Amino acid sequence: TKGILGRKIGMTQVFGENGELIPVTVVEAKENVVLQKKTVEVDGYNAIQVGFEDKKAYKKDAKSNKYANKPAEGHAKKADAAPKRFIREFRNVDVDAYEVGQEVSVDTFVAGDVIDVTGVSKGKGFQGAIKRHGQSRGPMSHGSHFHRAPGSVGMASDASRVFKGQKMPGRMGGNTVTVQNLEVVQVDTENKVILVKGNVPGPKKGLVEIRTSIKK
Amino acid sequence: MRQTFMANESNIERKWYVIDAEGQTLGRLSSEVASILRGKNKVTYTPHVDTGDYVIVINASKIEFTGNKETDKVYYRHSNHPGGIKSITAGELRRTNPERLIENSIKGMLPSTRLGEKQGKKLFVYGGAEHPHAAQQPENYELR
Amino acid sequence: SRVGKKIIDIPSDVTVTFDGNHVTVKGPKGELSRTLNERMTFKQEENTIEVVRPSDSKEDRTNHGTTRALLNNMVQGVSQGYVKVLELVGVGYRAQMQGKDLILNVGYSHPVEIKAEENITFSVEKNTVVKVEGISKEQVGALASNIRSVRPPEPYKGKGIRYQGEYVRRKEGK
Amino acid sequence: MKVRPSVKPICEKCKVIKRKGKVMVICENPKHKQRQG
RNA sequence: GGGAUAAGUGCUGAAAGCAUCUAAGCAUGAAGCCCCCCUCAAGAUGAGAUUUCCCAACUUCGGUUAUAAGAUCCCUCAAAG
RNA sequence: UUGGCACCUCGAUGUCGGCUCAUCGCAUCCUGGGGCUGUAGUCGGUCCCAAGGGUUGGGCUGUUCGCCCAUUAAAGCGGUACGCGAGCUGGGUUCAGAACGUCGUGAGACAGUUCGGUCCCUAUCCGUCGUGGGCGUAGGAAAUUUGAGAGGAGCUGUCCUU
Ligand SMILES: [Mg+2]
Ligand SMILES: [Mg+2]
Ligand SMILES: [Mg+2]
Ligand SMILES: [Mg+2]
Ligand SMILES: [Mg+2]
Ligand SMILES: [Mg+2]
Ligand SMILES: [Mg+2]
Ligand SMILES: [Mg+2]
Ligand SMILES: [Mg+2]
Ligand SMILES: [Mg+2]
Ligand SMILES: [Mg+2]
Ligand SMILES: [Zn+2]
């Protein structure tokens, strides 16, 4: 099992051998390094901690996340690696194969590999029940004073309360989503890009976590 | 004249004990442990303070049930979500989590008050024979 | 329990060792070990083993009968073993031995394979008769039951895997 | 199987037994099979 | 896919010399149960773990202090609102 | 269900149907697993286990029902103030107008009909859905996390091959 971290550059299409159009998402997986290796002996579970995308080294009066802080720099230095913006663990990958400070490359993944891609979905802000929960609108005429309302929120004296998990208006998006059984169309070592068939969760410039499909 | 002694944190001293759950009925072990946790066996027992002693229970896995409790006895919990009722049989609970079975039995036999909650916290249950509280220097207790 | 009271004879070749409730019976074909009921008391003689119920209570009587029968089965099993013959019936129904495992073809698009077990022997004669032989009576029976379960006998034509001496009720098709 | 409160022999062959705390009738004739319930 | 099961189906087996799926014992058996898959989750007050960073003077010797690592105010913003 | 009773509410507990949103039971409509069959096969009948998921659009009528059309794996039955009007509608019913039949000497009346006919309310508390702050978690911090718990999902057709 293999895992790489990347940013979602955007979507495009590629023409297949048969001339079939394949919609694809461009992912850049440059600057991936194994920052730490966790084992059952020490941490109680086996995983590799991988850092993606180098950030600037510590400076005295850094006011932003662009420059690494002292605590982060130390953790990266232990791996003999530059400070990283994003760090994520991969439990799927075997600990023995990877070594601390080892670069993880796009070439690990190959074309035709079935993969599961994880990312935070795009944020929609505060949303009503119709958009958020796919509920039906009320009549738009015939005396209607019900259009985009949530509907009844309960019964009457029995219960005399709203049950937990009642679908109501609230903030929508920003959730972690894993799309399963996507495929790698192409891997570009030169550009450090992996082409993934279909669309992956989240905004452009959003971190995507590509793993080998759990279901096989 | 008012002469009844009242225990206070200054004059209260709590000991540590170890009880083996091997070949012991859950209820009968639990009932006795609850009294030790409450401090009912102390002559200086005062209701509004905790005079009770800490208890360690070992070999929780070896607790015994009678009849068909292993299958028939069911523990229901509700999640507070509609239709959110979950069930575990006593036998299955013993296998999966031996400690929880013992704890819940004893905690059910303690008063549902702020003091009562504290008295339950003094209970430590371990499914294996070994316990991690050697520093506390517990004394082996034999159920009467 | 008349059965319980009856002594279990030991063949001279067979050697039986009792360890508390548990009994280990050693025979030329194999050695069988089981744990008998704790209450039941067993008196061992070279010629034969005698089991006596501790009390006349029903529970002891039932266990006495079971214990006696079980012990007898082990001794006889190690001495001679138990063999059960299963016969496939109907056209296109055949049995073939792949190594230890038995492969059966019984009107199924997929071929059926049954894994062999320790202290059990699978053998096919004429491609229609299968014999399961083992020291353990139970183990022989269990594996035989699995073989029969693959395709049980049908009433209308009698097609299927059956025990050699099994009787099947017959219903007229039309 | 016939599941009924009144489980009794329909013929001579039928044999009344108790399995898993439930009275049942077992017979050569499959029809005669019953289970108390 | 796995484990445990229902109605079932048995294997061995006595009470009850026979019989018997059950009593002891041993199997098998559902879109159902517990998992497997997905998301949240240590206010899990039982508050867990791993890695890394910071680490001094005063003082009535009780402790205090601003500072360290770090984070903010304020400001330019959006992939967030 | 139709009733009986008159125990809460007459200094007000809004009443049918639909819409919106569900939630629960299982006496199971479909799908899953079985026993028996007057079960050849394909199909069925009947009974047992099973509530995970699913369980359509129209014509007529205020309708609920029901009938019909065309589907479907199936078009389940019930409870939740005949769920849900500080969520919606207001066609029926249950004000004032008018008319017909009918009854009444009449004024008028009719679980007879007909046409028309004002649906208020800025959420305090619990509850529910989101989103912050304080303190705690025996030094102060930056990250990466385990999962006690909890939620989600869970459906099926047809065709080919054998
Ligand atoms: Mg609509
Ligand atoms: Mg409007
Ligand atoms: Mg209301
Ligand atoms: Mg009758
Ligand atoms: Mg009265
Ligand atoms: Mg009032
Ligand atoms: Mg039922
Ligand atoms: Mg109503
Ligand atoms: Mg009206
Ligand atoms: Mg009028
Ligand atoms: Mg009237
Ligand atoms: Zn009969």
From Swiss-Prot, chain A:
Region (Disordered): 129-155
Name under which the protein is recorded: Large ribosomal subunit protein uL3
GO CC term, one of those recorded: cytosolic large ribosomal subunit
Annotated organism of origin: Staphylococcus aureus (strain NCTC 8325 / PS 47)
Lineage: Bacteria, Bacillati, Bacillota, Bacilli, Bacillales
One GO biological process term: translation
InterPro entries, A to Z: Ribosomal_uL3, Ribosomal_uL3_bac/org-type, Ribosomal_uL3_CS, Transl_B-barrel_sf
Sequence similarity: Belongs to the universal ribosomal protein uL3 family.
Subunit structure: Part of the 50S ribosomal subunit. Forms a cluster with proteins L14 and L19.
GO MF, one annotated term: rRNA binding
Pfam families: Ribosomal_L3
Name of the gene encoding the protein in the UniProt record: rplC
Swiss-Prot record, chain B:
Source taxon at top rank: Bacteria
Any one Pfam family match given in the protein's UniProt record, by short name: Ribosomal_L13
Keywords, comma-separated and alphabetical: Ribonucleoprotein, Ribosomal protein
Disulfide bonds: none
Family: Belongs to the universal ribosomal protein uL13 family.
Known role: This protein is one of the early assembly proteins of the 50S ribosomal subunit, although it is not seen to bind rRNA by itself. It is important during the early stages of 50S assembly.
Protein name: Large ribosomal subunit protein uL13
Gene source species: Staphylococcus aureus (strain NCTC 8325 / PS 47)
Taxonomic lineage: Bacteria, Bacillati, Bacillota, Bacilli, Bacillales
Curated annotation (Swiss-Prot), chain C:
PROSITE patterns: RIBOSOMAL_L6_1
Cellular component terms per the entry's GO annotation: cytosolic large ribosomal subunit
Keyword RNA-binding applies: yes
Gene3D superfamilies: Ribosomal protein L6, alpha-beta domain
Designated gene of the protein: rplF
Role summary: This protein binds to the 23S rRNA, and is important in its secondary structure. It is located near the subunit interface in the base of the L7/L12 stalk, and near the tRNA binding site of the peptidyltransferase center.
Stated name of the protein: Large ribosomal subunit protein uL6
Molecular function (Gene Ontology), one example: structural constituent of ribosome
Biological process according to GO: cytoplasmic translation
UniProt keywords, alphabetically: Ribonucleoprotein, Ribosomal protein, RNA-binding, rRNA-binding
Family: Belongs to the universal ribosomal protein uL6 family.
Subunit structure: Part of the 50S ribosomal subunit.
Record InterPro entries: Ribosomal_uL6-like, Ribosomal_uL6-like_a/b-dom_sf, Ribosomal_uL6_a/b-dom, Ribosomal_uL6_bac-type, Ribosomal_uL6_CS
Curated annotation (Swiss-Prot), chain D:
The keyword Ribosomal protein is annotated on this UniProt entry: yes
GO annotation, biological process: translation
GO cellular component terms, A-Z: cytoplasm; ribonucleoprotein complex; ribosome
Cysteine pairings via disulfide bonds: none
One GO MF term attached to the UniProt entry: structural constituent of ribosome
Pfam families documented for this protein: Ribosomal_L36
UniProt keyword annotations, A-Z: Ribonucleoprotein, Ribosomal protein
Descriptive protein name: Large ribosomal subunit protein bL36
Gene that produces this protein: rpmJ
